[PDB]
């Protein structure tokens, strides 16, 4: 219904800045911002200044909040 300012975020599990048919490189760690969300099998974000699509399965959308 309503939405924020403050949209999702995704954190690397692993190295996925490999050789992919037009997808995203990315460093085990680096946080990449949710732009598009294709659907809940992919994501399309943007780090670095480098636009691509990654897997979910790769990342974790644990990013952000913090549970004790």
């Known amino acids: ?3 924020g300012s403050s ?3 995704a954190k690397a599990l692993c190295n996925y800045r490999g050789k992919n048919p037009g ?3 990315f460093n ?3 946080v990449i911002l949710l732009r598009r969300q294709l659907d ?3 994501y399309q974000g943007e780090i670095n200044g ?3 699509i990654f897997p979910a399965s790769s ?3 644990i ?4 549970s004790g």
């Open 1 to 3: 219904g309503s939405s």
């Open 28 to 30: 085990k760690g680096d």
């Open 23 to 25: 997808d995203l490189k």
């Open 63 to 66: 990013s952000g909040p913090s």
């Open 59 to 61: 990342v974790e959308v």
């Open 40 to 42: 809940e099998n992919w």
């Open 50 to 52: 480098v636009s691509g």
């Open 7 to 9: 949209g999702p975020r």
